[PDB]
Enzyme design. Sequence first.
Site, short mmCIF file in Angstrom:
data_model
loop_
_atom_site.label_atom_id
_atom_site.label_comp_id
_atom_site.label_asym_id
_atom_site.label_seq_id
_atom_site.Cartn_x
_atom_site.Cartn_y
_atom_site.Cartn_z
N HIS A 161 0.76 -1.21 0.10
CA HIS A 161 -0.20 0.16 -0.04
C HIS A 161 0.91 1.27 0.00
O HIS A 161 0.91 2.02 0.82
CB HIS A 161 -0.89 0.09 1.21
CG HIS A 161 -2.02 -1.18 1.05
ND1 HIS A 161 -2.05 -2.20 1.86
CD2 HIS A 161 -3.05 -1.20 0.28
CE1 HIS A 161 -3.22 -2.88 1.41
NE2 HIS A 161 -4.04 -2.07 0.39
N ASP A 212 -5.77 5.26 -0.79
CA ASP A 212 -5.16 4.64 0.17
C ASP A 212 -4.00 5.63 1.11
O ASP A 212 -3.05 5.23 1.48
CB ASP A 212 -4.14 3.37 -0.64
CG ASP A 212 -4.93 2.24 -0.42
OD1 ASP A 212 -5.89 1.99 0.17
OD2 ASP A 212 -4.77 1.48 -1.40
N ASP A 247 -8.80 -1.70 -7.58
CA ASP A 247 -8.11 -2.01 -6.56
C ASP A 247 -7.78 -3.54 -6.48
O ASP A 247 -6.84 -4.00 -5.76
CB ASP A 247 -9.00 -1.39 -5.12
CG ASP A 247 -8.24 -1.25 -3.93
OD1 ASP A 247 -7.01 -0.83 -4.13
OD2 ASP A 247 -8.85 -1.18 -2.90
MG LIG Z 1 -7.63 0.73 0.70
ZN LIG Z 2 -5.93 0.11 -2.65
#
Ligand SMILES: [Mg+2]
Ligand SMILES: [Zn+2]
Length: 333
Positions: free
Chosen positions: A84, A125, A237
């Site tokens: 991430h 994110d 995602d």
């Molecule tokens: Mg996320």
């Molecule tokens: Zn993500």
Amino acid sequence: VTAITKVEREAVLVCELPSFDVTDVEFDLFRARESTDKPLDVAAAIAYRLLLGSGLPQKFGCSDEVLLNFILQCRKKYRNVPYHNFYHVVDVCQTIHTFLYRGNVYEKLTELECFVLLITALVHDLDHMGLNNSFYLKTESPLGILSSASGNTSVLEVHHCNLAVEILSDPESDVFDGLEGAERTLAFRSMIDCVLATDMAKHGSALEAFLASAADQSSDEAAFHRMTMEIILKAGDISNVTKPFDISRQWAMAVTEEFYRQGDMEKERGVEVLPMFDRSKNMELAKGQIGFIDFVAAPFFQKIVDACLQGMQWTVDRIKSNRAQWERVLETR
Ligand SMILES: [Mg+2]
Ligand SMILES: [Zn+2]
């Protein structure tokens, strides 16, 4: 939050990405990161080129400089975590660009919606620390307590939205500053709804609502558009399994390492460690990828493609091809 400098801008602008087509479904972000010793500049140059190449920022009064300031303000808020990080959100931005323009999903949305989706990818994110919502709730961390006290269990997604709003609150990095009234409200609301919809605890309800809207020729049009945006950000995602096998595998290794680091921290704090997060479990990549394909990704991509997004058929085909390749890994072990 400090103003982006000329020098920071110029370090992205020198990146020419020779031999890369950022618009291609087989674009390889790991090869782009290996291409130079400034991978964060190359990643920012990819995002910049995707956004200018769309022609969208220009149409909504967003200058080249404000777009680049936004990208670098997003970049400063990603951490050095295995999965991430900035490379994930640039990958999601590039992936969404392919869904919109190679998969013809742009036909379902307004130009503003397309612009918002590409910009949303980069905020979705912000400040991720490589720990999921469950970690914050299980450990009763302060952010977990605040989420429980305030009545929203989407611990991280609400946090990402808070930092997106902070970036957009300065005109020098507000890609929506060219908007006013209803259009500006729609840009912020749709960005925030999209980020909140990335919480995987809402996966089945979000997919079900989209499928019921797509099947309903009398669906509210504004609601159909918003759910299409949410579904496209969710698709981006969980798109790692839709990529060529060796890209798919490098993402899967980054995810596993992030999950193992969480499991290590959960062990040291004495809370529940799921087998997926346990180094000592030694679970095989092949079986984990096949499991994620069978139970999450293949049904998600097949259902949205059949319901409405026919131009994204290549995602279902690649998942099927990746599952067959993991099966060859098991067959030959
Ligand atoms: Mg996320
Ligand atoms: Zn993500």
